[PDB]
Design an enzyme around this catalytic site. Structure first.
Site, PDB file in Angstrom:
ATOM      1  N   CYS A 169       0.842  -1.173   0.000  1.00  0.00           N
ATOM      2  CA  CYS A 169       0.000   0.000   0.000  1.00  0.00           C
ATOM      3  C   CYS A 169       0.858   1.195   0.000  1.00  0.00           C
ATOM      4  O   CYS A 169       0.544   2.200  -0.651  1.00  0.00           O
ATOM      5  CB  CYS A 169      -0.919   0.052   1.231  1.00  0.00           C
ATOM      6  SG  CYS A 169      -0.240  -0.540   2.829  1.00  0.00           S
TER       7      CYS A 169
ATOM      8  N   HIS B 289       1.194   5.160   9.943  1.00  0.00           N
ATOM      9  CA  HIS B 289       0.360   4.185   9.384  1.00  0.00           C
ATOM     10  C   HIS B 289      -0.652   3.636  10.384  1.00  0.00           C
ATOM     11  O   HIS B 289      -0.379   3.510  11.587  1.00  0.00           O
ATOM     12  CB  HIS B 289       1.271   3.067   8.901  1.00  0.00           C
ATOM     13  CG  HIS B 289       0.621   2.161   7.930  1.00  0.00           C
ATOM     14  ND1 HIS B 289      -0.451   1.350   8.266  1.00  0.00           N
ATOM     15  CD2 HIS B 289       0.867   1.950   6.610  1.00  0.00           C
ATOM     16  CE1 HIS B 289      -0.814   0.658   7.196  1.00  0.00           C
ATOM     17  NE2 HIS B 289      -0.035   1.005   6.179  1.00  0.00           N
TER      18      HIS B 289
END
Ligand SMILES: NC(=O)c1ccc[n+]([C@@H]2O[C@H](COP(=O)([O-])OP(=O)(O)OC[C@H]3O[C@@H](n4cnc5c(N)ncnc54)[C@H](O)[C@@H]3O)[C@@H](O)[C@H]2O)c1
Ligand SMILES: NC(=O)c1ccc[n+]([C@@H]2O[C@H](COP(=O)([O-])OP(=O)(O)OC[C@H]3O[C@@H](n4cnc5c(N)ncnc54)[C@H](O)[C@@H]3O)[C@@H](O)[C@H]2O)c1
Ligand SMILES: NC(=O)c1ccc[n+]([C@@H]2O[C@H](COP(=O)([O-])OP(=O)(O)OC[C@H]3O[C@@H](n4cnc5c(N)ncnc54)[C@H](O)[C@@H]3O)[C@@H](O)[C@H]2O)c1
Ligand SMILES: NC(=O)c1ccc[n+]([C@@H]2O[C@H](COP(=O)([O-])OP(=O)(O)OC[C@H]3O[C@@H](n4cnc5c(N)ncnc54)[C@H](O)[C@@H]3O)[C@@H](O)[C@H]2O)c1
Lengths: 333, 333, 334, 334
Positions: free
Chosen positions: C152, C179
């Site tokens: 990602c 994150h």
């Protein structure tokens, strides 16, 4: 009083913190196949809720021993209870705190190592069940394997006993608002046994099932079948609160109920039942080592026979104290 | 049906999202001194729970108007209700959703601008109180200022009415597990009126006081004085769950209670009361626009006269729908 | 045409499926997950903590075997072992490997034995070639038995890094990422033998965590290979991350010029992949955003005109799941 | 000797007080907060969500006027306006300005009118000189009527930046901070006229937020003035932050050498101010840690030997509150 721990988890590590601190017990053996000897060192030292440890404890040898000041603890990694040599290093007492071996049948694998007793750190389908302060005296030197009930039962029974001892409980329903535990998931994941339990733990209120009210009957027979309940898991790391809606036999105003509990908190039940009139919220009980703390200003009464009572508990630290207290009570018949 | 909003907050913005979406009402005026005209634009557009808006709305002029597709909304910033010219731009209906003007006396300052009605977005000490689906018909064109009750009352009354309509409620105690709101604090801060309320909101379970059970009596007189309750604020941004422990007059098994509620959810109370048998947790109701959703698998019964019922609600989005539904019901006598 | 299979019905598994199901150009053939019952699969697909209830469809018919998605029927597998997966036997030409446990090129290959023509690994690999859509998905060649859609984070970084590189050139760059938590973390302090900090209770810690994303960019963008390195901190949010980019540039620039440049490329070749906002955004603003990387102009800061910090938002779950579907489509054509 | 006053009994206010109360070399004279009742003050001091119950003392006697801390009695003020604060009338020689709303040099001065000899601002100022303990608290001179203890973040950065600078020299540096929420944020999306992203619900967003910390370092460390700039992200943790430092150095180095250097300075001049850990830490590990900056060796990463990223932990509430007390002590001697 030599104690071994099966499964060095929240409860196991905490129970180790408690044991190592007391002077009347000693920590002999730890088992956990999923944690290497050194790693145990790290996990024991640091803690997200309870803080860095304040005395000391390190890795002595490649995989077999930790040093606490001057006391060796040996380290095992054995997948199967029956193959844990609790004998070959002392440890008459075993705390079963893995969560997979609550069946008295399965916990008995510990008797096969060198172990006089087993304390299961959870409710058992089929093991005598004791809650310190309420029925620990019903214990016997002839019961091999025992259960310390669950954190919720430990919070409930002490309030329950006092309430029924003096006003009688026709009927009771309990709800707990409870912190998340290791069985939950950070994000929506699989949990076949309980679906609401895979949902992302810190982002939901998750209804959840609890057998504690049905367990209070099984350590307090007067109340057998007279209470039940449910739970809500919510996004706090630790600490939970029990909420008991009961119907009283003998009429009692709220203030009466209040200082009837205050008394026991000062009397027989000091150190198990607490009482407060402050404006506490749950962080206020992180590290509190009582079983149950009654929250006076919180509760409410509809009528003098129908009332709602609120009690806090630190599901991790309180319950872990009680485990040690059971074990000590055990060794003294 | 021209609607003005006082206080463009959670409820006010949400109510704006709801109004702008319906075709039978229109959003005429917004007031909020603490938010500049453009800023309103940003706050309306983006939302942490409800998402980015999906149709459209921008700033037309330096400080007086926003453009929704082709409908102007004028923008005020007036600290004092009596000095809001709802008249001089139309808006017969005013949603009072600041939280400071719940006194019928204080909300009446709106009649002094050009306003035929006022809907207070909270309970009032002294204003008629209506909960759509339960007592909105008790309304009259002669009542100037009204209240939509509170989110909890809106979740409770609909379940309460059905429960008592068919089995009768001797006695009831309600607990709500509830999301945090604007009145709480990110870190331990001052809140003189309620101390447990300054504690850091997303890190605690905070007991909190709720008048909703005492309010259900005041829109549903059969039950007046027959329920009370407390609350727990917990760390979720939105969505709450009501937990009602009731004693039933006429014996009813759980399944009976279940499909008695299922029926009303399909019948008279569709769109107000919902029913589910799924394993929902609270994120499942973000955006749900019912008043109350009954959670069957969640609840529990001790005996057929003593039972615990669980119902969800999206405190922000459900209650905001109901506000608009009250207003529309208003304009049609 | 274009039937798809999913191994690992998890966050990326179920979400790539909400995607494949919404598109016309692709079909969902079957799913495999040994840990989810057929009926459980409908519960998990249906309700989602981050992305809401699914609003088109959707039920099951076969005691254990088959799920009805609207009228399309999906075949349900509960099989541990990948080569035991008879994908073809239920015409599944493309297999999304979103298990987390088979990111090896030979490891993924087990899917081919099953009678399956391509396997897209929803995670970076040691071997499998890495393509990032909008950056180098053209290197795909029809020969490639097995592919990786990388990570990602690499999807947020690469697109952005290219525009910066191919307009001012990156000399030296360091990357931080803030994150969201993932399924590899723990609710409560618990065992994480491979990564100790990662065993710590996830929603109550800021957690230093490792990432290769800056080096994976070199493997998908050999221009940059060896000029980027980074780290991350996991933090208590359920979804959406942000990339923090510290770069020095050969070609002098202003913040305004780099801002204009990004906007340009944003509607150019990189529309729908790289996005550009100048609003006062926060991470919830990006939940359900299908773009791989969204540049945040007002957030960033500049030191020189050669020393700058660049902020890009991204929804690690949804952007990435969109990208997987995209890359598969491009492999069906090329 | 050394009596202290606190204006603003908030997070920094109450915590600096748990500190001043635990030390022998300093006394707590009185507190002012117009928003906290005398009895409320005992509740708020007593119970704390992050730092636990207070374990020494502690009650009140005077209907509204006086609090008993053990046997020391503290005078309680509820007065809006600073110059209306008769500090001297209750011998309070040093006033900690932890209100958040008087960080101006002339603004703070109102305390002097009150009969008070020095005012330490627990927050950076536009004017008031900025000293960071362990970096430049020696520039204090007895003339300074009014002082600033700068910011939590500047205290983590400066100590660290010096060691790096005074051993390899910083050419160019960019700073990110991952920071905990504070009282300026909102539980729920709400109005933040001065900072729009900062109005967004705090425990459910990663929030880009501004910081001057990298430029304040230049004002307290004029060696570096103009070579640092940065930004922050607020994230859902109640206390403890971490500094993310991206620097390029004139003097080539290895990660090991910079690691050794920090450890050295850690027990040298900068012991108790700069700390050094090589463990697998996460942010809860630093709650109640009194050091201004704790360097985290295993977290950081290096690109060259001139391009590196450096990680330092810090407990924004407790380290900073300790530092305020420290700086006051040094001003009492010098
Ligand atoms: N956390 C609480 O609030 C709490 C309270 C009361 C009771 N309990 C009970 O305690 C038990 C464990 O709870 P926990 O919260 O500590 O969970 P946990 O997941 O942190 O602990 C489980 C530990 O057991 C180890 N383990 C697993 N299988 C093993 C094996 N076969 N041999 C040795 N070790 C093994 C694991 O590695 C892990 O460290 C459960 O039965 C739980 O119901 C927990
Ligand atoms: N959030 C909920 O779950 C919820 C549910 C039901 C009812 N309510 C009720 O709604 C009301 C507001 O709730 P909220 O949650 O939207 O809070 P909020 O703090 O977000 O909204 C308050 C708004 O009013 C504005 N305001 C304050 N004083 C004003 C004035 N004098 N003139 C004009 N605007 C002014 C503020 O700037 C703010 O935008 C309260 O009465 C609350 O009890 C809230
Ligand atoms: N979640 C994210 O933000 C995200 C983003 C990008 C990439 N990824 C990558 O995606 C992969 C999966 O990530 P995730 O986040 O969905 O993980 P996840 O845990 O949510 O999903 C993994 C799924 O695989 C299933 N599974 C486990 N073993 C299996 C097996 N033998 N056969 C079939 N199914 C099996 C599990 O039941 C689970 O449903 C990882 O490689 C990760 O790096 C994840
Ligand atoms: N919290 C932190 O992490 C932290 C760290 C470093 C520096 N600071 C700085 O500290 C200052 C205060 O920060 P905080 O975090 O404690 O804020 P806070 O909101 O928690 O405390 C401010 C206190 O000031 C009181 N107050 C407001 N107006 C007042 C007035 N007129 N007179 C007397 N008291 C008044 C409030 O009641 C509150 O108790 C700010 O300048 C901030 O930048 C805070």
């Amino acid at each position: 009083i030599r104690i071994g721990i099966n499964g060095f988890g929240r409860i196991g590590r905490l129970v180790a913190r408690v044991v190592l601190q007391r002077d009347d017990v000693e920590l002999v053996a730890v088992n956990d196949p999923f944690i290497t000897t050194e790693y145990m060192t790290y996990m024991f030292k640091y803690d997200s809720v309870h803080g860095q440890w304040k005395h000391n404890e390190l890795k002595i040898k490649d995989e077999k021993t930790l040093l606490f000041g001057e006391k060796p603890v040996t380290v095992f990694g054995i997948r199967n209870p029956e193959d844990i040599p609790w004998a070959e290093a002392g440890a008459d007492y075993v705390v079963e705190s893995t969560g997979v071996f609550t069946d008295k049948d399965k916990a008995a694998a510990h008797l096969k190592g060198g172990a006089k007793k087993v304390v299961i750190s959870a409710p058992s389908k089929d093991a005598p069940m004791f809650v310190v302060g309420v029925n620990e005296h019903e214990y016997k030197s002839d019961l091999d394997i025992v259960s310390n009930a669950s954190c919720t039962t430990n919070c409930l029974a002490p309030l329950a006993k006092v309430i029924n001892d003096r006003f009688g409980i026709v009927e009771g329903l309990m709800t707990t608002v409870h912190s998340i535990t290791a069985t939950q998931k950070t994000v929506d994941g699989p949990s076949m046994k309980d679906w609401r339990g895979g949902r992302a733990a810190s982002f939901n209120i998750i209804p959840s099932s609890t057998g504690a009210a049905k367990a209070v009957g099984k350590v307090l027979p007067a109340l057998n079948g007279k209470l039940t309940g449910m739970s809500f898991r919510v996004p706090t790391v630790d600490v939970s609160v029990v909420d008991l809606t009961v119907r009283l036999e003998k009429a009692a105003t709220y203030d009466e109920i209040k200082k009837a509990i205050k008394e026991e908190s000062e009397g027989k039940l000091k150190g198990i039942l607490g009482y407060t009139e402050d404006d506490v919220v749950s962080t206020d009980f992180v590290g509190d080592n009582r079983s149950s703390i009654f929250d006076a200003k919180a509760g409410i009464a509809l009528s003098d026979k129908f009332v709602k009572l609120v009690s806090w508990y630190d599901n991790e630290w309180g319950y872990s104290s009680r485990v040690v207290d059971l074990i000590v009570h055990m060794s003294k018949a």
